Amino acid sequence: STPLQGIKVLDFTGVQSGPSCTQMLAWFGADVIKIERPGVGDVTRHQLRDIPDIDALYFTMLNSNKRSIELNTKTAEGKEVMEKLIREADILVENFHPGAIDHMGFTWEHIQEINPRLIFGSIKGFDECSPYVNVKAYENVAQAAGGAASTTGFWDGPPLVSAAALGDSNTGMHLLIGLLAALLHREKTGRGQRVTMSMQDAVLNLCRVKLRDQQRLDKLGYLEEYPQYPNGTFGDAVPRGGNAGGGGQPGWILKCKGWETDPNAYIYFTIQEQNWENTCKAIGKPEWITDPAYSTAHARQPHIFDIFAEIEKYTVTIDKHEAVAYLTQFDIPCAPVLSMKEISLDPSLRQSGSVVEVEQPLRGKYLTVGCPMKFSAFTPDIKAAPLLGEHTAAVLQELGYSDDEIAAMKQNHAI
Amino acid sequence: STPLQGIKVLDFTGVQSGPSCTQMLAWFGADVIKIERPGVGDVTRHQLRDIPDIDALYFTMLNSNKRSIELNTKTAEGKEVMEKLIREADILVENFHPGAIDHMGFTWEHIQEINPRLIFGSIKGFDECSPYVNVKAYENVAQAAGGAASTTGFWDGPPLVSAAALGDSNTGMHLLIGLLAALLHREKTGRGQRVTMSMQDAVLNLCRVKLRDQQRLDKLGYLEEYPQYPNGTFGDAVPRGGNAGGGGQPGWILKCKGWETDPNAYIYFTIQEQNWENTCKAIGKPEWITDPAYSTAHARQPHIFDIFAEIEKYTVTIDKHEAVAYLTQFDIPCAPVLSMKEISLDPSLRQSGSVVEVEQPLRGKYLTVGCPMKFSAFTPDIKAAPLLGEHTAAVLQELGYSDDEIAAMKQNHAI
């Protein structure tokens, strides 16, 4: 049994935000029918290809386990298929521009009439009433609008985007929470509803603690743990803090052996408040244990980069993995800056199902990020991504179309 | 009606990752009973305080709607209360070090015997088989281990952490998906189960597209859309790309008027492949429309920073908001880099429920991030965070304890 056994998803999404949400739904046991433009398909199929003429990894890593149908919803036969899909569906997920579904002949009111149980999930760039309501939002557009770029990077550099998909996959995971909550709600009301999620709000949610810091700043005029305290300057907005800790425990990114030629020969190192004595023992600075200039976070803060520099004298002499194996014995919170190469090959992440090898037609093996959370009663089975239109016939057959009707729809380009 | 009406959560979490998850559970209608150490409470109550002697915003922004009980589970009476709480609960969440709950006297086995319906959610730094299992993971430690620090920042700078809580809140949102799935699964199995979520895996999941890029790099030796192509150099790992788009459409962070003294006087600007003609018109360069050195993404790539410099000649002349209002009419994807000050005061984010003003005892008003997703059939009510032990008596009363028994437990220090 799987959590979403028997749930049927009508999936119009493309790219990353919507598809990450629906791939999870598939992994949870739902039947995800991905509706794609005939002869075109989700754009990720053809972007960033590593092997000529076959689906790109962009596609395969975000569409595992889905069924692909080609359907041209602008045609009258396509419209009729869609109505039948809506009628049988538990969830419809879309990440089009406002009014796309309405213009296909299916307003929310019309959808409720066809299927009052249906849960309608929509990803947009900004919320309904926003001044940016018609910006077309890509990943980094949302990162700018949601607070992350403003607060990421260095105080003496530009706003910086994160590699992490705060606008795209993070929005998908938030929509998924909403869809799962709406399935739970449906069990009580007997009804579906519309769940909307904006990319700007997804970013903002992960930046919650920077809105903590803005209020502190408004009230006090400084942030005691930020690099700018006490010798630099605070403006009216939360500033960029480089590689600072972000919470109650300060830290930094420190160079390890190889950093001149290896851009990932680094660790993150935390000076944990309750672990100062251990930290001194690790670096061989017993004099610092009780010196009042060093014994509290308060006293450390005004010369904290001298202390990081002193720790870096140790870390530069050894490989990041060996640095972490040593430092962790002293309870120091640290880890290596693992590169995507290390992650791709890490045998532990294969064993834990975090990185998963998957067999794909025409390609052979590829790696994906697996189902992030582990369940003691359920094991996902991560499968190939569908070739374009691979499941069109099967889906139409399930709606009661004959093989001849299906062939006629292929010939007149409804599919 | 609420999505989680009638659900009871036994919540041991502190700091950010676990509390973010359970705050959302409360907002969805669950009764979240937060278990705190008598006389001390979640550390966030006293860290980064803006107002002396009352609960910090670190705490109130992450613990809205929860009930607080003070309970020493290491005592015999506290253990007996805990057993009664387990019997009544649907979900127990914890983000302690491995084995803490076992040590309390409740293995997962023993919990299953007491309450076969209970879903046990656990947040850890790393997965069970990891070499880093007993590393203490803070926010940025997980960012390092998860691939984000490696791939964020500039190619000629160090790895950079993100302001966005990739390790903390993001992990809480991923556990939340699991718990909601587990509730759904329970409707069929009649049984709870254990759901575990590591911070490393949460980071990795958002970095999924960087694993796409690693595989592309492994196969081809270069990433054609990365800043380093074609005139720079690729190594064996996906490199940092500064403010590059991260997907199929290139972009960058551009200066707007005021940038020399306003570290957030910037926009994100996407050069969308189908929108070159309009991009040229927006910046008054009609001659670039059909010039073969500019008309395609492939041709633009080797000189893309000149192109951005040229756009920047326009954007530096106007406020970032006016830049976006204009450029958007030319279909150019863009948004301001909004500061946390602008976010905190943005009337549209108030209207949309994205930033919410909450009345808190002793403090007055504070701002929080609201419930990220919107539901057409459900409106969350965000309320104050609990004062330490504010609900101890009521919780024990609901378990059948008399006032005398409760007062006796206070004097004993079991509560």
Curated annotation (Swiss-Prot), chains A, B:
PANTHER family: SUCCINATE--HYDROXYMETHYLGLUTARATE COA-TRANSFERASE. Induction: By the acid response regulator EvgA. Involved in the catabolism of oxalate and in the adapatation to low pH via the induction of the oxalate-dependent acid tolerance response (ATR). Catalyzes the transfer of the CoA moiety from formyl-CoA to oxalate. It can also use succinate as an acceptor. Signal peptide: none annotated. Substrate binds at residues 247-249. It is an enzyme of class 2 (transferase). HAMAP family: Formyl_CoA_transfer (MF_00742). This is Formyl-CoA:oxalate CoA-transferase. It catalyses: formyl-CoA + oxalate = oxalyl-CoA + formate; formyl-CoA + succinate = succinyl-CoA + formate. InterPro entries: CoA-transferase_III_domain, CoA-Trfase_fam_III, CoA-Trfase_III_dom3_sf, CoA-Trfase_III_dom_1_sf, Formyl_CoA_transfer. Gene3D superfamilies: Crotonobetainyl-coa:carnitine coa-transferase, domain 1, formyl-coa transferase, domain 3. Pathway: Metabolic intermediate degradation; oxalate degradation; CO(2) and formate from oxalate: step 1/2. Disruption phenotype: Cells lacking this gene show a reduced acid tolerance response (ATR) during the adaptation phase. However the deletion of YfdW has no effect on survival in oxalate-containing challenge medium. The active site is at 168 (nucleophile). Homodimer. Belongs to the CoA-transferase III family. Frc subfamily. Its EC number is 2.8.3.16. CoA binds at residues 16-17, 37, 71-74, 95-97, 103, 136-139, 272-274. One of its GO terms (biological process) is oxalate catabolic process. One of its GO terms (molecular function) is formyl-CoA transferase activity. Keywords: Transferase.
